[PDB]
Structures are given as structure tokens and as C-alpha cells.
Coordinates of C-alpha atoms and ligand atoms in Angstrom, one line a residue:
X54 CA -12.6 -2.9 -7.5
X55 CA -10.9 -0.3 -5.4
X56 CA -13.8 -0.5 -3.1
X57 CA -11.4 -3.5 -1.2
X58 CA -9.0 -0.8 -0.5
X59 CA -10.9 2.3 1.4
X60 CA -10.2 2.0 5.0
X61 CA -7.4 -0.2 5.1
X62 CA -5.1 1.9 6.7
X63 CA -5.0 2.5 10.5
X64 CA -2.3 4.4 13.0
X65 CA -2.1 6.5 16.0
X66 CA -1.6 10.5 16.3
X67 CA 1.9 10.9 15.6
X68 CA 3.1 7.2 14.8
X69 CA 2.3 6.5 11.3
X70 CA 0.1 4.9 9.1
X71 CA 0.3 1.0 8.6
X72 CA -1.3 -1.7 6.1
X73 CA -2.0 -4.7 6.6
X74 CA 0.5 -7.2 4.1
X75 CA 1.5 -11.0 4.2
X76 CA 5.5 -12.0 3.4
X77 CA 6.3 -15.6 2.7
X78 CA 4.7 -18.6 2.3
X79 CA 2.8 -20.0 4.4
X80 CA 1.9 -15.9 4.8
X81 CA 2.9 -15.0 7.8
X82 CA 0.5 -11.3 8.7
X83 CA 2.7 -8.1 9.9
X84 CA 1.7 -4.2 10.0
X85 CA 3.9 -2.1 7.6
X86 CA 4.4 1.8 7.8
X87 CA 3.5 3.2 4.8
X88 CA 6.3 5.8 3.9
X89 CA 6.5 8.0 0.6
X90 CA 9.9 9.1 2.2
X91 CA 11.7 6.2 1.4
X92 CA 12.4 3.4 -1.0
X93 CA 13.3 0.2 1.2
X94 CA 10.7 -2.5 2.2
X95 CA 12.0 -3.7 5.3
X96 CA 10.6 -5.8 8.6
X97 CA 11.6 -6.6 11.9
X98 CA 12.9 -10.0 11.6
X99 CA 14.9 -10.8 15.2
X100 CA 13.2 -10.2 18.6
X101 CA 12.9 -7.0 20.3
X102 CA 11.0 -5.4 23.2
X103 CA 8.6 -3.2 21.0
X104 CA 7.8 -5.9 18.4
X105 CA 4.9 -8.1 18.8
X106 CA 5.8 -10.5 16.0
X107 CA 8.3 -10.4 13.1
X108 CA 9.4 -11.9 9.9
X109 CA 10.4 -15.5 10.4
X110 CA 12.6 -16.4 8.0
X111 CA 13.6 -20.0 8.4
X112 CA 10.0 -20.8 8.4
X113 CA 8.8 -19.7 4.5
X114 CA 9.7 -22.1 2.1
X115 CA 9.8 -18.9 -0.3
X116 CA 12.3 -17.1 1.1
X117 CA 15.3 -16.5 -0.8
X118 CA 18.5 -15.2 0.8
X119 CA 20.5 -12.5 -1.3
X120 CA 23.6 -12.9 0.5
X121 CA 23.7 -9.1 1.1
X122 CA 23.6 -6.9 3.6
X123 CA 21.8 -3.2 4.0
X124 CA 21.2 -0.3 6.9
X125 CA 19.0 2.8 6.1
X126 CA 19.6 6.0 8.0
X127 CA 16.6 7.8 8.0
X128 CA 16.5 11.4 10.0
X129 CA 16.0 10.3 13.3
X130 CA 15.7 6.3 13.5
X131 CA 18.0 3.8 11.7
X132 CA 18.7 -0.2 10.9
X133 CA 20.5 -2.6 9.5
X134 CA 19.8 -6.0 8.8
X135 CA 19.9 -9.0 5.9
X136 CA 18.7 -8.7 2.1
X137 CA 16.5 -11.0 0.7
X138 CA 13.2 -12.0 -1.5
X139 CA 10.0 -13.9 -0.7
X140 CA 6.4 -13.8 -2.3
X141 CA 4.7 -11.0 -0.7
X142 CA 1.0 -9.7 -0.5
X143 CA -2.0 -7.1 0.4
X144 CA -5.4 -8.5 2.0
X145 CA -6.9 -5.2 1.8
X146 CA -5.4 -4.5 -1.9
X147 CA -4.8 -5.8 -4.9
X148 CA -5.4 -9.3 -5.6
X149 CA -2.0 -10.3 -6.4
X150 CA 1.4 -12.1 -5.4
X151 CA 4.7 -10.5 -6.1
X152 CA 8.5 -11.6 -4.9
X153 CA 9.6 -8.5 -3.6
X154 CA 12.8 -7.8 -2.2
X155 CA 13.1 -7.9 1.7
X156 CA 15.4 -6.4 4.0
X157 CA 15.1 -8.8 7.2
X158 CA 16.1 -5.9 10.1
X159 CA 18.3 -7.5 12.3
X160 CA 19.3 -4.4 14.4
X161 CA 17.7 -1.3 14.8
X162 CA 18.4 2.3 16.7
X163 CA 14.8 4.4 18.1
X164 CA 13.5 2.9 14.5
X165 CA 10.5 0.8 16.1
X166 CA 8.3 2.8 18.1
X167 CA 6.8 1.6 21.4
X168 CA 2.6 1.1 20.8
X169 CA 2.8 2.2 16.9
X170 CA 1.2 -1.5 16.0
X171 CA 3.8 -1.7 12.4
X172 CA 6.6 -4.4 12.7
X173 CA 7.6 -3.0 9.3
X174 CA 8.2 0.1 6.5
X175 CA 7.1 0.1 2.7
X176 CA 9.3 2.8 1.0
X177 CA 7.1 3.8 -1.5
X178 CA 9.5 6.3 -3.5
X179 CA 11.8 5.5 -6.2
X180 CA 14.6 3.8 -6.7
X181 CA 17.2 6.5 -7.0
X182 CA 16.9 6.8 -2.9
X183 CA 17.2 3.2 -1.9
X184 CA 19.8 1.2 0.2
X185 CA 22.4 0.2 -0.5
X186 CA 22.1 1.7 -3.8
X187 CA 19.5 2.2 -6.9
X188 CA 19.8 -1.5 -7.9
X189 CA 17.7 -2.8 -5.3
X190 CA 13.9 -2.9 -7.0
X191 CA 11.4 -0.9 -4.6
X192 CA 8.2 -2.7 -3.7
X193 CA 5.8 -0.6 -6.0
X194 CA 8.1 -0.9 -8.8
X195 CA 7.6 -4.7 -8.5
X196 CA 4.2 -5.0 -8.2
X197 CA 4.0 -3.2 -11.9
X198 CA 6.2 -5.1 -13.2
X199 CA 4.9 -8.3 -12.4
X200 CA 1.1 -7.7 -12.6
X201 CA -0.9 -5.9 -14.4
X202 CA -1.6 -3.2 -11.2
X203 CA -1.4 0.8 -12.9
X204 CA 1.4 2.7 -12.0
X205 CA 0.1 5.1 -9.6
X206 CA -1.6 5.0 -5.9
X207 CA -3.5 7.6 -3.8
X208 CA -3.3 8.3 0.0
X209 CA -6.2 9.6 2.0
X210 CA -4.3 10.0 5.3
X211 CA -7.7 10.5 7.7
X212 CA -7.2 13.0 11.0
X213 CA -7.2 6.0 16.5
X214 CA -6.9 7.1 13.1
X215 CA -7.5 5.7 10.1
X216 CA -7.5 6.4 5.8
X217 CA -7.3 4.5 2.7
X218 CA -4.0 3.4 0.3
X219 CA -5.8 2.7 -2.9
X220 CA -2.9 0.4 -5.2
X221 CA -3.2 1.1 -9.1
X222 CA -5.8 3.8 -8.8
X223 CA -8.0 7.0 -8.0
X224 CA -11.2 6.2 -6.3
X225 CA -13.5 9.5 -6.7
X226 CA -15.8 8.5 -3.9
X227 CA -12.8 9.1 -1.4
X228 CA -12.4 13.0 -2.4
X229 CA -14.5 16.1 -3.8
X230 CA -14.1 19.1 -5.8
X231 CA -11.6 18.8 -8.5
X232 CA -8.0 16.8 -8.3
X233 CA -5.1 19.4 -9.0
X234 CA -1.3 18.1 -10.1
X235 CA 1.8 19.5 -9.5
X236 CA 4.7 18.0 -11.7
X237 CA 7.1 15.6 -9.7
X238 CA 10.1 17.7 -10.2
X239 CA 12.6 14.4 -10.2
X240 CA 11.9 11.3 -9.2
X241 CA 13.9 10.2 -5.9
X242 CA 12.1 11.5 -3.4
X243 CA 8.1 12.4 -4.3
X244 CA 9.9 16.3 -5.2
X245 CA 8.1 19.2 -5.6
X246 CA 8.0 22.8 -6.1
X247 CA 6.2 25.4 -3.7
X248 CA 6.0 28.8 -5.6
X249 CA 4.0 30.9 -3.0
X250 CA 3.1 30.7 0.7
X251 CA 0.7 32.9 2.9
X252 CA 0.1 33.0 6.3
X253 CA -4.0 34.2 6.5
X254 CA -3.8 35.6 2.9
X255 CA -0.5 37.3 3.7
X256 CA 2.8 36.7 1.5
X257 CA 5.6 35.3 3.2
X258 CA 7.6 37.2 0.5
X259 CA 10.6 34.9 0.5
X260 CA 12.5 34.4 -2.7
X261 CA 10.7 31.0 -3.5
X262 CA 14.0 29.4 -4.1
X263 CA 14.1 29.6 0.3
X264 CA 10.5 27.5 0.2
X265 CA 12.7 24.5 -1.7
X266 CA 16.3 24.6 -0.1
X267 CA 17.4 22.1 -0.8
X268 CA 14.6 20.6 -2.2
X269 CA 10.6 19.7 -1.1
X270 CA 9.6 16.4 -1.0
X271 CA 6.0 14.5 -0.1
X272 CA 6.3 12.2 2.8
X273 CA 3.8 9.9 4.3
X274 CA 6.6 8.9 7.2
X275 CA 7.2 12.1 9.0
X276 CA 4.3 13.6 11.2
X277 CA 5.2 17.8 10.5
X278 CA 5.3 20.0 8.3
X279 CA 8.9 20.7 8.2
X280 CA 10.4 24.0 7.0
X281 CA 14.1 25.1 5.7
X282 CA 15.3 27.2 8.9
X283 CA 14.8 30.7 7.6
X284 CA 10.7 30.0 6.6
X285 CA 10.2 28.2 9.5
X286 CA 11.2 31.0 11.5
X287 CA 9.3 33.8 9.4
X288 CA 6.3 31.3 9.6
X289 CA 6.4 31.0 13.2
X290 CA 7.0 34.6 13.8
X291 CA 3.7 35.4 11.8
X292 CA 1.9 32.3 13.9
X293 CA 3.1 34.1 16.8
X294 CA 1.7 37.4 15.6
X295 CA -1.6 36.0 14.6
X296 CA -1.9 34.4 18.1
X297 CA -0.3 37.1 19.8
X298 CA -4.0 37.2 21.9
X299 CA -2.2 34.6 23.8
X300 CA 0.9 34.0 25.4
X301 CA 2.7 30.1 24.9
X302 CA 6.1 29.1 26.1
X303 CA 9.2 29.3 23.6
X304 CA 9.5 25.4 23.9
X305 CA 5.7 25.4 22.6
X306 CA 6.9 26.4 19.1
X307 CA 9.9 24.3 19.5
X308 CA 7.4 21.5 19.4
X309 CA 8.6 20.7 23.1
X310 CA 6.0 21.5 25.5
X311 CA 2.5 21.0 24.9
X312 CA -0.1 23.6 25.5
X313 CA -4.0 22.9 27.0
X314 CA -7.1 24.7 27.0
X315 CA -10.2 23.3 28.8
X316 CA -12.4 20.7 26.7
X317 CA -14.1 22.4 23.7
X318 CA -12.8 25.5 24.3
X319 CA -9.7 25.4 22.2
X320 CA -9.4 29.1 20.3
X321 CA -9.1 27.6 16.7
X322 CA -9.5 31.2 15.6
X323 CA -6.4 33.1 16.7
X324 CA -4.6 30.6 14.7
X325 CA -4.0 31.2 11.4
X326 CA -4.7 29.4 7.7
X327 CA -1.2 28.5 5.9
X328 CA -1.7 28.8 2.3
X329 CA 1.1 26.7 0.3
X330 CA 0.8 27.3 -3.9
X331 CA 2.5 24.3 -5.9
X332 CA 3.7 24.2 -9.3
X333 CA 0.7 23.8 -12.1
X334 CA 0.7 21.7 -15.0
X335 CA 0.2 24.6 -18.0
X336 CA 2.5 27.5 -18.1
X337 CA 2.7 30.1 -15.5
X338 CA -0.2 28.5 -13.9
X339 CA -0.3 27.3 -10.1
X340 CA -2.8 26.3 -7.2
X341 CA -2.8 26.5 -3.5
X342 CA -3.8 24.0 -0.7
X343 CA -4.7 25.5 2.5
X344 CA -3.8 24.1 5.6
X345 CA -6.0 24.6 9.3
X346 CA -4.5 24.9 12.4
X347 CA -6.9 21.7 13.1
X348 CA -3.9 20.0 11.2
X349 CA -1.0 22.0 12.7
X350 CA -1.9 21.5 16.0
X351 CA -1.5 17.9 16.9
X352 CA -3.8 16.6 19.3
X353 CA -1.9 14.8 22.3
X354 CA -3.2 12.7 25.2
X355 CA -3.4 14.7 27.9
X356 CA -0.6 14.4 30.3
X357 CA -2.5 15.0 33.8
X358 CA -5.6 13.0 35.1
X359 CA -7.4 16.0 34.2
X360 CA -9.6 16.3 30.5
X361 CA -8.5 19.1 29.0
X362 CA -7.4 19.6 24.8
X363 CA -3.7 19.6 24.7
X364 CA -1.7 20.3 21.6
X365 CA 1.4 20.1 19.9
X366 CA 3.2 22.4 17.9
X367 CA 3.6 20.2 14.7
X368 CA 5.3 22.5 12.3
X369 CA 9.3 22.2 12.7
X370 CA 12.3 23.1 11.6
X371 CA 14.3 21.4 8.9
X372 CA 17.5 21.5 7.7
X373 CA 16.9 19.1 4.4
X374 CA 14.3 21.2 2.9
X375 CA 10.6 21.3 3.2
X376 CA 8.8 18.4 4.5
X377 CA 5.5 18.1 3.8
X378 CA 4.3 15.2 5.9
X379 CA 1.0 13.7 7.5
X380 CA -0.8 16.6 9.1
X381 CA -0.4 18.0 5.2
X382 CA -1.7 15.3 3.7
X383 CA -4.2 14.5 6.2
X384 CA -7.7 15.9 5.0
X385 CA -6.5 15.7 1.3
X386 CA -6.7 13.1 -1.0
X387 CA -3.0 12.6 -3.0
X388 CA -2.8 10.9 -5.9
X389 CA 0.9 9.5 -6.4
X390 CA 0.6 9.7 -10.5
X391 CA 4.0 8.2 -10.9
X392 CA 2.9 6.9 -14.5
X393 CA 2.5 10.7 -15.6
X394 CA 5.2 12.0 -13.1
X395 CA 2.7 13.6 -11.3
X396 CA 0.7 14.8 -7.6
X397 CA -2.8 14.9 -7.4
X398 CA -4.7 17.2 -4.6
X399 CA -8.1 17.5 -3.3
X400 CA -10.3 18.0 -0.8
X401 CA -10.7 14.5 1.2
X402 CA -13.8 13.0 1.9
X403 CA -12.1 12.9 5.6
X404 CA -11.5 16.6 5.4
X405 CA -10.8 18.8 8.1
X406 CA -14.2 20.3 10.1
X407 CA -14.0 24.2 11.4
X408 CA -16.7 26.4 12.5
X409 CA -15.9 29.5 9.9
X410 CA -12.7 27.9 7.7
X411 CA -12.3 25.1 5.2
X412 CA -9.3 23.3 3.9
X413 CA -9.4 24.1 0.2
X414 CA -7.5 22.8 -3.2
X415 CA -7.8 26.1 -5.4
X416 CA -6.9 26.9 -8.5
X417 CA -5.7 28.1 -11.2
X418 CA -3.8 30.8 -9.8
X419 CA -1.1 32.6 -12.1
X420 CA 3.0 32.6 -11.3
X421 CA 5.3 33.7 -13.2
X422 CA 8.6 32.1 -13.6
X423 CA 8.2 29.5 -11.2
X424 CA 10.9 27.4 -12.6
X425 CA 13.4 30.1 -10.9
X426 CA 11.7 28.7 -7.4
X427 CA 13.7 25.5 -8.0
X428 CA 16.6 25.0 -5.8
X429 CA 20.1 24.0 -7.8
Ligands
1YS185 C1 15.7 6.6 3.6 C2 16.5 7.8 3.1 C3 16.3 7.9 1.6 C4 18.0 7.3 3.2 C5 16.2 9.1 3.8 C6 17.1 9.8 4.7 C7 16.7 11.0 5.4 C8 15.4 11.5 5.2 C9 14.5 10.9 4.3 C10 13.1 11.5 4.0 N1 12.1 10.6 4.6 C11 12.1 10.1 6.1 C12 11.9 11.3 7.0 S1 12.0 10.8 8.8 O1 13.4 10.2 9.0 C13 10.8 9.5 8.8 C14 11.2 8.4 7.8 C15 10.4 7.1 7.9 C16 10.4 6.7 9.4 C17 11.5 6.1 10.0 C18 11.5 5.8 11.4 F1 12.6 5.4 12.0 C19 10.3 6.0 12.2 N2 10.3 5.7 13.5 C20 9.2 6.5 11.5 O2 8.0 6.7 12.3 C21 7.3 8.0 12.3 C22 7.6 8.8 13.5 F2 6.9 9.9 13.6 F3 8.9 9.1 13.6 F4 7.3 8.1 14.7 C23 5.8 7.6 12.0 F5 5.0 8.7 12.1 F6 5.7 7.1 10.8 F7 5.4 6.6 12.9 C24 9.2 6.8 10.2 C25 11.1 8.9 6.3 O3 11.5 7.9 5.4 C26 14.9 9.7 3.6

């Protein structure tokens, strides 16, 4: 029946991807952010100038107030607002009703963004990462209890966009080739291990430890790839090299400027393929999922009257680990496996289209001692 979920997930370039869900009762409709980065359901529930609608309270006859307050500090945006349950539920997605707890945001800081189309954010992660602390139940973790939904989703985050959330399973007509897991290292964040990166078949040669400082974590909510300061600047510097052809400015690789080439002319080939090898499942054993600068390269709305293709840098620097977020995913299919503590990869249906390279999910490769690539 997971045929009711493909395509029910919709964004723009650089703000997210929303589903469609239904709190209270009568159900009242908002867009929700769908985040793997956090743990919180939350939802605009006071006026303000980049909301269309919000979470009226006072008029579900469901609602429940817990008498608590909350805020979540995320990297960049934050809010804070009232705790609460009500009955809660998917039109595109399972058929079920579940009380869920609610955090009704109240006040927010450069949390809603202007033209996204999501009032909301599901925090899809665990409950060792949510406000105010590990007691409050995450959404996900109440749907499986209360129905008989599987414990696991997948993503297909498509590259005016859209993709697929598919609740309590793996539908194989959304990907091809075969699914590969890597082990989720602890579960708080969606953590995982990176053994090995290449830039165009070429070895970073880091000690793997510097690939998970502190730690690497799978997050629908953040649009880079986000790298620990010292890869992101022996990644750039290769970029550089590889694109060396061409001259950009400094803030291009800062993800400041934007640069622009005329329509259909954009040199996908002096940019290189970034190879990123996760932790297998068997011993010693590994696999890699290659990345195209189709992904890397956000495409922006042009910022003359003119048509040209401008770009944005969309590989940054972190200072929390590696972030591996929607212009990774996009072009896979990821299976969230939480029942086996597990990440599924393959090749999307929706996958990436270049002239001469493919996005690939390869494997097995062989690594030795890839528990020493652990950060501690
Ligand atoms: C929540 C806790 C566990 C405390 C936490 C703290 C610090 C880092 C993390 C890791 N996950 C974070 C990384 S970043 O802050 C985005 C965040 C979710 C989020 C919060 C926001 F405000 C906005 N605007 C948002 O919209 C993005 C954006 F690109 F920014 F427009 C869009 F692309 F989705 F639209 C997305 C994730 O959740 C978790």
C-alpha cells in the first residue's frame, strides 16, 4: 500500500522538504519539514509574517495542554513555544491516527523561512536528541507504538522539487540496483561512519577519524554537505585543482557569491565526482556512494533579468562534524532501518542525469579496521 506515499513530498531548492499532515480535531491541514536532524514535532502556532496558517489551538477539541514549556536551538534558526498533545495524521501516508506530542511555537528566531510553504518540523531522529530532554516521545516513536506501522521509513529526496517519505516501509519501485547498509553507529542523531573519501578516484588520505570529528550524522534539514574544517578545506582545495581550468571568486567556495555560465553551457566536467565509503555490515567490508557536481552545485534563480545557469557552492564547512544533508541524499533512495539500526542506499529512481558520469552505490569494497575511524 505504499503506493499512497510516492510523491508526497514537495519543497524548493534550498528550503526543505515538507509533507502534508493534519493535527487536531476537526484536522486542521499544515506543511511540515521533514527533518532527520532532529527529534521535536513542532508548528507554528501564533501569527507571524512568513506563516500562512498555523496550529489553532483553542479550536481542537483534542488538544491537550502539558503544562510545559520547550525551545530547540538548531544551528542556525531557533524557537520556543508551549508543550502539548493532540490526534495527529498523514493524508498521503499511513492510514492511521496517533496523539502525538506537539510543541505549539510561540516565538521563533530566522526559524520560518520566507516562501518555503512548511508552517511546521517533524524531527524524525531519536529521542536521546529531543527538547527539553529524552522523555518527550518523538513522532515516529509514537506512530509504532500505537499502530501497527514497521519501524523503519525511506526518503527519496528528488533534485519545484519533489520525492517520496514512504512510513513503515521500502518500496522497490522508487530505487534500482541493490540497497547497501551502513550500521547506525548510536542512535541520537541518524550517526554514521565514513571510512574513505576520494575526490575523482583520488584519496583524500586523512586519518578517517578527521572524516567523523566529532561525529557524522544523516540529515534531511540541512541543504550541504557539511565537512569538519580540516576535510572541507583539503576537499575544496582538490575541487579547486580539478577546476583550476577556471577561475571563481574566494566567496564562491565560501558558499557566498554565486557563479553563472550561459544557459546549457555549464562545464559539468571540470568538476569533480566525490566518492564517500561508509561503514559495511560484515567485517572489514564497506561501500561507496558517489556524489556529482549536479548535486554540489545548487542551482539558484538567477539574480539579473538575464537567463543564464547560476550556481551555488553547496559544500560547507562544519564545525559539528560531517553533515550529510539533501544534495547527498537527493538522487538516492535511504532507507531509515531504525528496527535493525540500520541505513539503506541506492541509486534513486530520481537519480542524477550527466552526459559521461553516474551517481553510483558500490560495493563491497574491503577496509580494514574501520572501527578506528570512529571519533571518541
Ligand atoms: C535539534 C538539535 C538536536 C538540538 C540540533 C542542534 C544542532 C544541530 C542539529 C543537527 N540538525 C539540524 C542542522 S541545521 O540547524 C537544520 C535543522 C532543521 C532546520 C531548522 C531551521 F530553523 C530551518 N530554517 C531549516 O530549514 C532548512 C534551511 F536550509 F535552513 F532553510 C531547510 F532546508 F529545511 F528549509 C531546517 C536540523 O535539525 C540538531
Amino acid at each position: 500500500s505504499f503506493v499512497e506515499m510516492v510523491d508526497n513530498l514537495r519543497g524548493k531548492s534550498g528550503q526543505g522538504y515538507y509533507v502534508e499532515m493534519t493535527v487536531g480535531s476537526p484536522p486542521q491541514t499544515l506543511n511540515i519539514l521533514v527533518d532527520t536532524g532532529s527529534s521535536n514535532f513542532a508548528v507554528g502556532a501564533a501569527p507571524h509574517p512568513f506563516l500562512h496558517r498555523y496550529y489553532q489551538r483553542q479550536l481542537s477539541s483534542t488538544y491537550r495542554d502539558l503544562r510545559k514549556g520547550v525551545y530547540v536551538p538548531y544551528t542556525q534558526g531557533k524557537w520556543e513555544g508551549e508543550l502539548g498533545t493532540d490526534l495527529v495524521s498523514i493524508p498521503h501516508g499511513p492510514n492511521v491516527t496517533v496523539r502525538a506530542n506537539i510543541a505549539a511555537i510561540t516565538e521563533s528566531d530566522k526559524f520560518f523561512i520566507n516562501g518555503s510553504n512548511w508552517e511546521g518540523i517533524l524531527g524524525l531522529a531519536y529521542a536521546e536528541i529531543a527538547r527539553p530532554d529524552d522523555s518527550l516521545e518523538p513522532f515516529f516513536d509514537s506512530l509504532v507504538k500505537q499502530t501497527h506501522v514497521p519501524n523503519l521509513f525511506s526518503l527519496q529526496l528528488c533534485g519545484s522539487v519533489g520525492g517520496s517519505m514512504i512510513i513503515g516501509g521500502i518500496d522497490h519501485s522508487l530505487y534500482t540496483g541493490s540497497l547497501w547498509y551502513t550500521p547506525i553507529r548510536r542512535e541520537w542523531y541518524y550517526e554514521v561512519i565514513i571510512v574513505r573519501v576520494e575526490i575523482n578516484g583520488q584519496d583524500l588520505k586523512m586519518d578517517c577519524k578527521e572524516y567523523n570529528y566529532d561525529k557524522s550524522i544523516v540529515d534531511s534539514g540541512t541543504t550541504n554537505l557539511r565537512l569538519p574544517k580540516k576535510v572541507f578545506e583539503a576537499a575544496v582545495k582538490s575541487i579547486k585543482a580539478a577546476s583550476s581550468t577556471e577561475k571563481f571568486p574566494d566567496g564562491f567556495w565560501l558558499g557566498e557569491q554565486l557563479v553563472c555560465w550561459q544557459a546549457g553551457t555549464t562545464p559539468w566536467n571540470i568538476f569533480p565526482v566525490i566518492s564517500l565509503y561508509l561503514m559495511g555490515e560484515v567485517t572489514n567490508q564497506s561501500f561507496r556512494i558517489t556524489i556529482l557536481p549536479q548535486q554540489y552545485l545548487r542551482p539558484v534563480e538567477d539574480v539579473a533579468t538575464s537567463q543564464d545557469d547560476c550556481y551555488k557552492f553547496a559544500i560547507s564547512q562544519s564545525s559539528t562534524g560531517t553533515v550529510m544533508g539533501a544534495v547527498i541524499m537527493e538522487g538516492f533512495y535511504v532507507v531509515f532501518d531504525r528496527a535493525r539500526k540500520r541505513i539503506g542506499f541506492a541509486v534513486s529512481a530520481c537519480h542524477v542525469h550527466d552526459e559521461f558520469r553516474t551517481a553510483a552505490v558500490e560495493g563491497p569494497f574491503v577496509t580494514l579496521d574501520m572501527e578506528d575511524c570512529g571519533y571518541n
